[PDB]
Amino acid sequence: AYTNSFTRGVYYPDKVFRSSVLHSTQDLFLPFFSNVTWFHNPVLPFNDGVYFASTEKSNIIRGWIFGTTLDSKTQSLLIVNNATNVVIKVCEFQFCNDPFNNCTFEYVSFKNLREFVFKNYFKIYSKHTPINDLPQGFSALEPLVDLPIGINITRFQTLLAAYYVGYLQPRTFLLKYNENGTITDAVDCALDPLSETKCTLKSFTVEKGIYQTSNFRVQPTESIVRFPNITNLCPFGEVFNATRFASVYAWNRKRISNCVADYSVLYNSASFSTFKCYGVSPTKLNDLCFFNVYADSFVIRGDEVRQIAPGQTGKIADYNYKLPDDFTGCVIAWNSNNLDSKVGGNYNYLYRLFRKSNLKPFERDISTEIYQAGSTPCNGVEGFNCYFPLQSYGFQPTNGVGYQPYRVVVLSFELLHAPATVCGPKKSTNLVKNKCVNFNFNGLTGTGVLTESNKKFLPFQQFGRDIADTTDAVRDPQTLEILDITPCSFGGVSVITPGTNTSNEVAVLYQDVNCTEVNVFQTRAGCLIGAEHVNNSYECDIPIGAGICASYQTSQSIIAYTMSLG
Amino acid sequence: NNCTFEYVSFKNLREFVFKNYFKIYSKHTPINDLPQGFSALEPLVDLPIGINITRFQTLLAAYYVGYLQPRTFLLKYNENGTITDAVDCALDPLSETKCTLKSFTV
Amino acid sequence: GKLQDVVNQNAQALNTLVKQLSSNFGAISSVLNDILSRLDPPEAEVQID
Amino acid sequence: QLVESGGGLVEAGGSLRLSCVASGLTFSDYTMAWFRQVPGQEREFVSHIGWGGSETYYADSVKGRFTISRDNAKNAMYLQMNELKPDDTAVYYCAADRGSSFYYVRESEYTFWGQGVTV
Ligand SMILES: *[C@@H]1O[C@H](CO)[C@@H](O)[C@H](O)[C@H]1NC(C)=O
Ligand SMILES: *[C@@H]1O[C@H](CO)[C@@H](O)[C@H](O)[C@H]1NC(C)=O
Ligand SMILES: *[C@@H]1O[C@H](CO)[C@@H](O)[C@H](O)[C@H]1NC(C)=O
Ligand SMILES: *[C@@H]1O[C@H](CO)[C@@H](O)[C@H](O)[C@H]1NC(C)=O
Ligand SMILES: *[C@@H]1O[C@H](CO)[C@@H](O)[C@H](O)[C@H]1NC(C)=O
Ligand SMILES: *[C@@H]1O[C@H](CO)[C@@H](O)[C@H](O)[C@H]1NC(C)=O
Ligand SMILES: *[C@@H]1O[C@H](CO)[C@@H](O)[C@H](O)[C@H]1NC(C)=O
Ligand SMILES: *[C@@H]1O[C@H](CO)[C@@H](O)[C@H](O)[C@H]1NC(C)=O
Ligand SMILES: *[C@@H]1O[C@H](CO)[C@@H](O)[C@H](O)[C@H]1NC(C)=O
Q: In this entry, which stretches build a coiled coil (chain C)?
C-alpha cells in the first residue's frame, strides 16, 4: 500500500539555536507530499536515508536491522528494544529470515507515532507524539542518538500495526524557527511555484506581485555529427589484387598518401593466409593516422613467411628483407600458387642467398655482384668459390602447401612533424532539424536548432557569423545546403501571484518562449501558464509586459487582460 | 626524386597570392599598367605539402610581383558575402580614422 | 541625436560584454570545452579559475 | 618454453585459476592466447589477451564467464574461471606470439605453444 506523507519528516540538521529566523538549508529531507510505502516483515534498501515511522499501541514494534548483507560474513548494525533497553551492536550476527562475532562497537542503554530518521556516520532522530493514515500537521524530530560505528549500510529490515517507510532526498528546505528555537514550520523549495517563491523571498508570506524565481533552460536531446562524404579511397585493389608481383630481393614499394585509409577491404577479405600486427591493434588502425602509408609487396615461399617479422633470422630475414626490432605496421601474406606458378616450374622470381652483412631494416639490395666465399677475389668470373647470389625459386603447381609461393604485402606507418592526411572514414549521422541538438559539423561544435536557411553562401564558404562574431549559419558538408542556427530557448521563470493573504493560486510566466518548450496564454513577454485571458480591460494590478497585466478577480481565479489607460 | 606529394588536376589579369601550409588564392578578370578598381581573390587551391619556401621563379607579357606585409585591413562585405571594398589601416590619417571608427564614411 | 545616443551607448556596452568572451585572461584557451578536454581536471581548475 | 600451472578437479560450479609462465621470452612485446583440446575432435579457441590487457576478446560460447589478465613483473599471465561447466572439462594449451592477428581465432596464428593442463 501507499500513503501521502503530508508534512512529516523534518529534523534538526544541526545543534545550533536560532530564534525567530527563517533559515534555508540544503540537506537530505523527506520531500513534501511524497509517497510513503505502507507495509505491515520485508527487507528494504538504504540508498541515502529512511523516515521509518510506526503506529504502535502497546510497544508491538520492537527494533531495527541494518547492514549490507544482513547476515554473517559482513558487519550489521542491530537495535532492539527487548522491554529493557536498546542494545546496539555492529557484530556480524546470524539474523534469521524473520527474527523478533568480531564486534567493534557495543552499547546497552493506535495513538502513537514513533517517527525515526536514519542516515549515515550513523545518526538517529526521533520524536514520539500521540495521534488519532499518517496525520496531517507539523512536528520536528530532535536528534536522539548518534553512533560512531561507521558501517557501510545499503539494506535494512524490521522486527515486531501501521509500518511506514519514507526515503530521504537531497532537497532544500526553508526552516521556520521560533523564539524558543523549535522548528514550527518549513517550506519545500521545489514542491510547487508558490513554494519556490516563498523560498527565494526567504518568507512564509508573499505579497501581491510577479517574482522571478528560477531560470528555464531547454536541454539538447541528441548529438549530431556530419562530415564530408567518402572521398577518393587509398589504393588497396591495385596492390592486393595487382596482376604481377615483384621478386623478394627487389621488393615492390609504394607510398600511399593523400587519401582515406579504409581498412575494411582487409577485414572482409577472408582469403588472407596471415594478418599479423605489431605494436598496434589489428582493429584500432583507423583511429590513429600518420603522414604516409608504405606498401612493400613481394613473393616468397611458405617456409620463410614466418621470417617476415621483427627479430627473425634466415635466408630471407637478413639477405632480402629485414624488419626493425621495433615495428609500426602489420604483415599480410596469402597463397598465390595459381598466380605465380606455371607448368614446368616458374623461375621468374629470384632471391638473394649470399651477402657479406645482414641487411639493415627497410633496405633493398638489387646488386648482382659475384660473391667471394673464400679468399680468392672473383672479379666477376662465377667459378670455383664464386657464386651468383640471385637464386631462383622452384615454383610448380605440384609443390606441397608449404612450398607454394606466397604473395606478401607489408604495411608500414611513418609519422613525422608534418601534416597527416591519410586516415579512415569519419562519423556522419542523419540530419535532424527543428530540435535543440548538440551539433558537430566538419570542425565546429555547438548547440542550437538547425533550420532550413535562406542565406546564399559563396562557393568556398562553410561558416556563418554575426556582428558579435557568433556562429550563425553552417553549410552542410554532405549536402551543400545552408542551415540557420538559433540557440534553443532559455530565459527566466516568474511566478505571478496575489498575496497569500488572499489565495495560494499562482500563475507562471516563461519569458521569451513559444509555449511549445515547457489555460496557456501566449503574450509578447512569454508563455503565461495558469491564468485566464479576458477580453475586458481593467487597471493594471500585476504588470507583465507589452501592456498585459494579470489580476486576481472573480469562483475567483487569475486573469490576464490588456491594461486600460484610464 | 623522393616525392612526397603529387597532384594532376592584353585583356587578362591572372592575380595570384601565395603564402605558407601552402595556400593559393586566384581571380581572373578581363581588363583593358595595373588597372585601378577592386576585385577580391577567392581561394582556389590549398595544398598540405609543408615545404620550407624562400625563393621562387617563373615560366613562360606583363609579369608583376607584389609582396605581402602584415597589415590590418577593414573589409567591406556586402549582402552576398563578397568583399566589395577595403581600407588599409595605415595608408594615411583618413584611413586610420575610418579603421578606428569601423566605418567607410566619417 | 539625444535619443539615438542612448541607443548606441547601450548596444556598444552590450557588444563589449559579449566580445569579452573571446579573451583568455591569462588562460590557455577562451573556449570552455577546449580547456576542459585538452587538460586534466587537476590542472583545468586553475585555467577555469 | 612456455611453462604453465593450475588445473585440477573442480566442484562443478566453483572457481579455478590458471597461469602460463614464459621462461625465454621478454613477455613485454608478445601476445598470448588460450586454446582448448578435446579428444576425438579438433582444437578449440577460448580466450585471448593483447599487450598489457587493454584489448581482450573471448569466445562466443565462453563470453561473460572467464576473465583474463597479464602482468609483466613475473613474465606470466593469469586466467581465472568463474563457472566451470561440466561441459568445459578439457585439455588446456597456452599459446603466444610476437604480435596480435586479425585471424586471432586461427590456431595457425600462434607459433609458440605451451605444455598441457590436467584434463
Ligand atoms: C503515489 O502518489 C500518487 C499521487 O500523489 C498516488 O496516486 C499513487 O497511488 C501513489 N503511489 C504510487 C505507487 O504511484
Ligand atoms: C535485553 O538484552 C540485553 C542484551 O542481550 C540483556 O542484557 C538484557 O537483560 C535484556 N533484557 C531483558 C529484559 O531480557
Ligand atoms: C572477524 O572475526 C571473525 C571471527 O570468526 C573472522 O572469521 C573474520 O575473518 C573477521 N573479519 C575481519 C574483517 O577481521
Ligand atoms: C559501500 O557499499 C556500496 C554499495 O552497498 C558500494 O558501492 C561502496 O563501494 C561501498 N564502500 C566501500 C568503502 O566499500
Ligand atoms: C517558549 O518558551 C516559553 C518558556 O518556556 C514557554 O512559556 C512558551 O510557551 C514557549 N513557546 C512560545 C511559542 O513562546
Ligand atoms: C510558434 O511556433 C509556431 C509553430 O506552430 C509558429 O507558427 C509561431 O509563429 C511561433 N510563435 C512565436 C511567437 O514564435
Ligand atoms: C630522398 O631520396 C633521394 C633519392 O636519391 C636521396 O638521395 C635523398 O637522400 C633522400 N632524402 C631524404 C631527405 O630522404
Ligand atoms: C626554413 O628556411 C629558413 C630560411 O629559408 C630558415 O631560417 C629556417 O630555419 C628554416 N626552417 C627549418 C625548420 O629548417
Ligand atoms: C547578390 O545576389 C543576388 C542573388 O544572386 C544577385 O541578384 C545580386 O545581383 C547580388 N548582388 C547584389 C549587390 O545584391
A: 4-48
